[PDB]
Design a protein around this ligand. Structure first.
Ligand code: 2L1
Length: 460
């Protein structure tokens, strides 16, 4: 039985509004309703992995697992295995996989982050799951961010706290937050960003929704605008939204948006909004294609509609050679030429690099670079031809061209990372000097750039 080079992943996010679900929720897992929907001809074809994020979930883990497993069994006639389940308050993530994947899945991690302080600590935050699928690392975050149209800045802060403090994936990757630890990272939830239009425009917005005219609403979506201004979710992608706002509905129908201020809302308006979202970030030049992104029309127990997204995702096999794992492959090497970091920092410490990759026996520390002043005020750290030659465990090009090198630039004085990024080895050529580039981030914000040339030697 051959190891896969692709899998499909289902992502669901649903704020259940503290109400039990209806008896049938299969439309969610089938990607049927509004938006980019899945073809009827695929209905019996299981996804490899289902990741379900709920918010305001009133069910026990046992109660929800029974509903999810029985749903998928009805759709596919497959009894899914539970990979992981983790709950923080009423925020939950479930990961289910086809039984044939049970011995492909390992290093399962779970964690949560509680956002806010005092007043604002006690119900918002995130849960997450990671694991290896053969040679590919996967991470999943379900976040319920701060509510309210006038709290977009708080949501951006919630985002930064979650990616700083959620402890998933390989702990040896100590300079790197979750936005660098995974081949594929999916981040979803009730992100709670709103359509920023005046309250007096509520009925005009409803009109637009009835006409399926979303353009003048999406141009005021806070998540799209904050992302465009690099305030949040830097280097994440989102599929185009072609479904109606998923919040705030009257329960038991989808015919009515309930937007007016009520004691129950703290006298806040809830203009129709795309609160419920799926974003992803994959390593450079790895196959990842969104094949659905939409909302259900027939699940009406909550004031939110469920959202689904599905993805094709490239995966690699657990490679063994005569040599690595457990030694190097003298036929393999990675060389860096003419490399320099450009940093936005005002500081004047020396810097060194760390190279981290599962193609190395352990991470590699460089010598300090040479600081120069850039023409427009910046710090340029030059490495020239000084960077160590990296010695991969396997030289086979079928393996090595699929790998990635994480780079951290660290202060000599403090050993703290000032920037993190990632370089693909999916090169146009081997034994050839080729340009490389990555942006550098720290706490998920842009801090600089790393660029230079690479020369990759494989056994071919
Ligand atoms: C430059 C680029 N290539 C693929 N994706 C991207 C980043 N995009 C580019 C355009 C854009 C517009 C609004 C909000 C976020 C983004 C992020």
């Amino acid at each position: 039985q051959p190891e896969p080079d692709m899998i499909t992943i289902f992502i669901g996010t649903w704020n259940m509004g503290n109400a039990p679900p209806p008896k049938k929720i299969t439309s969610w897992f089938l990607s049927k309703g509004q938006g980019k929907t899945r073809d009827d001809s695929a209905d019996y074809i299981p996804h490899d992995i289902y990741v379900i994020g709920t918010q305001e979930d009133p069910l026990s883990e046992k109660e929800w697992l029974e509903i999810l497993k029985h749903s998928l069994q009805e759709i596919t006639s497959v009894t899914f295995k539970t990979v992981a389940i983790h709950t923080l308050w009423n925020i939950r993530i479930v990961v289910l996989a086809k039984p044939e994947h049970e011995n492909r899945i390992s290093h399962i991690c779970t964690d949560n982050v509680k956002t806010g302080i005092a007043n604002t600590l006690g119900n918002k935050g995130a849960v997450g799951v990671s694991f290896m699928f053969n040679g590919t690392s996967l991470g999943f975050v379900n976040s319920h961010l701060t509510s309210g149209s006038e709290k977009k800045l708080r949501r951006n802060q919630n985002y930064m706290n979650i990616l700083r403090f959620l402890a998933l994936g390989d702990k040896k990757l100590s300079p790197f937050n979750i936005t660098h630890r995974f081949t594929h990272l999916f981040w979803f939830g009730d992100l709670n960003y709103r359509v920023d239009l005046p309250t007096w425009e509520a009925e005009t917005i409803i009109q637009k929704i009835k006409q399926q005219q979303y353009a003048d609403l999406l141009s005021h979506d806070q998540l799209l605008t904050e992302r465009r201004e690099q305030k949040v979710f830097l280097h994440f992608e989102e599929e185009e939204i072609t479904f109606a706002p998923t919040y705030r509905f009257e329960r038991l129908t989808r015919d009515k948006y309930a937007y007016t201020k009520q004691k129950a809302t703290g006298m806040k308006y809830n203009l129709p909004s795309w609160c419920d979202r799926v974003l992803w970030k994959s390593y450079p030049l790895v196959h990842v294609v969104c094949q659905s992104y939409g909302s259900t029309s027939d699940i009406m127990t909550s004031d939110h509609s469920p959202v689904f997204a599905t993805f094709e995702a490239g995966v690699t096999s657990q490679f063994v050679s005569k040599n690595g794992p457990g030694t190097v492959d003298s036929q393999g090497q990675i060389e860096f030429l003419r490399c320099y970091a450009t940093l936005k920092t005002k500081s004047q410490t020396k810097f060194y690099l760390e190279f981290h990759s599962s193609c190395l026996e352990s991470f590699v520390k460089s010598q300090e670079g040479e600081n120069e002043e850039g023409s427009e005020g910046e710090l340029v750290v030059k490495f020239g031809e000084t960077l160590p030659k990296l010695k991969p465990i396997i030289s086979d090009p079928e393996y090595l061209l699929d790998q990635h090198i994480l780079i951290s630039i660290k202060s000599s004085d403090s050993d703290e990372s000032y920037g993190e990024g990632c370089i693909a080895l999916r090169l146009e050529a081997t034994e050839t000097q080729l340009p490389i580039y990555t942006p550098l981030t720290h706490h998920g914000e842009l801090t600089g750039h790393f660029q230079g040339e690479i020369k990759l030697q494989t056994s071919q």
